Design a protein around this ligand. Structure first.
Ligand code: NA
Length: 83
């Protein structure tokens, strides 16, 4: 029948690291600048080195956008796909 659903949009991502969009470190801010992502328009979390799931030992999040094969994700919120 219906398949299981979690994120309203996109797949569940497994991200090595997540950061508050309003407290990014200087390295992450620079990388986003390099990608021409406008930081002031971001909400929630930024994920770095993210891959979509179809098991994750790091952070499982739902994101609005993924860039450069998951180097950076934006609009990410924590999600719990377990019990
Ligand atoms: Na762990």
């Amino acid at each position: 029948g219906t398949p299981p659903k979690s994120c309203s949009s996109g797949p569940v991502y497994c991200c090595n690291k997540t950061e508050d969009s309003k407290h990014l470190d200087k390295g992450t801010t620079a990388l986003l600048g390099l990608l021409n992502i406008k930081i002031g328009d971001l909400k929630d979390l930024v994920g770095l080195n993210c891959s979509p799931l179809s098991s994750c030992s790091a952070q499982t999040v739902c994101c609005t956008n993924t860039y450069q094969h998951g180097l950076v994700n934006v609009g990410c919120t924590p999600i719990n796909i377990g019990l």
